[PDB]
Amino acid sequence: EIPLKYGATNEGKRQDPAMQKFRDNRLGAFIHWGLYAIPGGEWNGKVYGGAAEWLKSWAKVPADEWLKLMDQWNPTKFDAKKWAKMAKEMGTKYVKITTKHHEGFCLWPSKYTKYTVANTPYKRDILGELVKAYNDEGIDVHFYFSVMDWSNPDYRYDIKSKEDSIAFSRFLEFTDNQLKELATRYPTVKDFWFDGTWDASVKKNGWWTAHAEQMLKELVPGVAINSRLRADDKGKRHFDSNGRLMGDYESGYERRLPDPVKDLKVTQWDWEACMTIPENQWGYHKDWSLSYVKTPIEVIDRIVHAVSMGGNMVVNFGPQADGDFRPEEKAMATAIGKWMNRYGKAVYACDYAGFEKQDWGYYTRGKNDEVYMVVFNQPYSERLIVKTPKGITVEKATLLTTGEDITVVETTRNEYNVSVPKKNPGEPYVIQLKVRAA
Numbered sequence: 001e002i003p004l005k006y007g008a009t010n011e012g013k014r015q016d017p018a019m020q021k022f023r024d025n026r027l028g029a030f031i032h033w034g035l036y037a038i039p040g041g042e043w044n045g046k047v048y049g050g051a052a053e054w055l056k057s058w059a060k061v062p063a064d065e066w067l068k069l070m071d072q073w074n075p076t077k078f079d080a081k082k083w084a085k086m087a088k089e090m091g092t093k094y095v096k097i098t099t100k101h102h103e104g105f106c107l108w109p110s111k112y113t114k115y116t117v118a119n120t121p122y123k124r125d126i127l128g129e130l131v132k133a134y135n136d137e138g139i140d141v142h143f144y145f146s147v148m149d150w151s152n153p154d155y156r157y158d159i160k161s162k163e164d165s166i167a168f169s170r171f172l173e174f175t176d177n178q179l180k181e182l183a184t185r186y187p188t189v190k191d192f193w194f195d196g197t198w199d200a201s202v203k204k205n206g207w208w209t210a211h212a213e214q215m216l217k218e219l220v221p222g223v224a225i226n227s228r229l230r231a232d233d234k235g236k237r238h239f240d241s242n243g244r245l246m247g248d249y250e251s252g253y254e255r256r257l258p259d260p261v262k263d264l265k266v267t268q269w270d271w272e273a274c275m276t277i278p279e280n281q282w283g284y285h286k287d288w289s290l291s292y293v294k295t296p297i298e299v300i301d302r303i304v305h306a307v308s309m310g311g312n313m314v315v316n317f318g319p320q321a322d323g324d325f326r327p328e329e330k331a332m333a334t335a336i337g338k339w340m341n342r343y344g345k346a347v348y349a350c351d352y353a354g355f356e357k358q359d360w361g362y363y364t365r366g367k368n369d370e371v372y373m374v375v376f377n378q379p380y381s382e383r384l385i386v387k388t389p390k391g392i393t394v395e396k397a398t399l400l401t402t403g404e405d406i407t408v409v410e411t412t413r414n415e416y417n418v419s420v421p422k423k424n425p426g427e428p429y430v431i432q433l434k435v436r437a438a
């Protein structure tokens with residue numbers, strides 16, 4: 001056991017009502033919106049294939065010239081109530097919003113920098129408007145915050161000199177200032193999700209990551225903080241030197257997921273995955289034809305996969321520069337919402353079931369020890385194999401959307417065939433199981 005001043009603060013999972021709400025929510029939306037939405041991946045007549053929110057980097061745009069995009073920031077179609085309605089209809093229980101991305105442009109009118117929505121033609125507090133509108137629909141709001149900031153020259157990727165140390169200290173104070181500000185202006189914030197924390201400068205300043213977490217928890221009672229922020233005394237990131245999760249939940253499953261057989265370790269801690277609809281675009285990119293674009297069922301599969309392994313999933317949207325959503329995103333939100341309305345009982349407030357993974361889909365476990373079978377792959381055999389842990393029996397099976405009774409047949413020791421339904425539900429569907437221990 002290695003002694004640490006700034007290692008993990010939680011032992012096991014938090015179970016206060018704030019964390020249980022964070023967990024029960026399960027399905028989130030991500031909003032990446034900033035100046036990058038104006039060029040939409042194109043600069044000086046070249047369309048760049050990389051992620052649009054990184055266009056400053058791909059097109060090698062100097063800060064002062066990138067930040068002039070502010071003179072074109074005028075999202076006249078923006079209506080926060082309509083954004084919140086689109087979220088509510090999708091079934092999203094929370095939204096994670098880029099308060100500021102790597103570019104450093106702020107969606108709220110910060111007093112600590114001029115690179116904010118206040119100094120645009122639109123002028124309005126986009127963030128405040130969203131927080132209110134989402135909250136009025138019953139949707140929790142989480143703040144994405146990039147520590148790395150391309151707009152502040154005091155930022156340093158590493159500390160290799162007295163000059164570096166002096167500058168980066170000014171940068172941490174500035175960061176501190178923005179964080180206190182966000183927490184005090186928007187006290188309904190439920191989470192801060194730090195990103196752009198990978199540089200050696202943050203690793204050397206692990207003390208600060210611990211301070212930021214503690215500062216925010218005092219200012220916002222119950223607030224969640226992600227593991228990405230954190231490094232310990234030894235410079236060890238995410239999980240401390242004693243193997244313990246730092247922050248409140250693990251956050252490294254970005255555009256990927258743990259394996260349902262090999263990675264059951266993730267069930268021991270809270271965690272949240274995120275994903276894009278195209279292969280790798282968070283902010284608005286004008287041309288989605290340049291990579292593969294996931295269909296709604298492919299996205300739902302990923303959502304259910306996360307919940308089946310005790311994790312949340314956050315699906316990204318990159319709104320247009322005019323304040324509206326592209327057609328592909330509207331279609332996606334609508335399709336997810338249609339599905340969650342019918343089958344969300346197997347997602348919201350659900351968790352890892354402890355059953356061996358089967359080919360037809362995923363198990364999830366409800367608050368009242370219900371076990372849901374979520375079927376993505378329909379067997380031609382008309383039989384869904386269920387292997388139970390030792391000492392566990394299956395008693396009933398019911399179609400979730402029709403109440404229709406479902407045959408259960410014992411096939412061997414600890415194994416059942418659960419019949420499918422008489423009519424193919426025709427999309428991924430859900431069977432609830434009653435189970436009994438010894």
Ligand SMILES: C[C@@H]1N[C@H](CNC(=O)c2cccc3c2C(=O)c2ccccc2-3)[C@@H](O)[C@H](O)[C@@H]1O
Pocket residue numbers: 051053054195196197198228251252253254255274282
């Ligand atoms: C949500 C997205 N986060 C990006 C930065 N993070 C990464 O690209 C990333 C991708 C996969 C895994 C990780 C990361 C990442 O930083 C990170 C830190 C610690 C553990 C795992 C990861 C940003 O660069 C993107 O613009 C977008 O905001």
Ligand SMILES: N[C@@H](Cc1ccc(O)cc1)C(=O)O
Pocket residue numbers: 352353354355365369370371392435436437
């Ligand atoms: N573990 C529960 C039974 C159970 C097991 C797995 C489940 O997915 C649900 C319920 C008990 O001790 O009674």
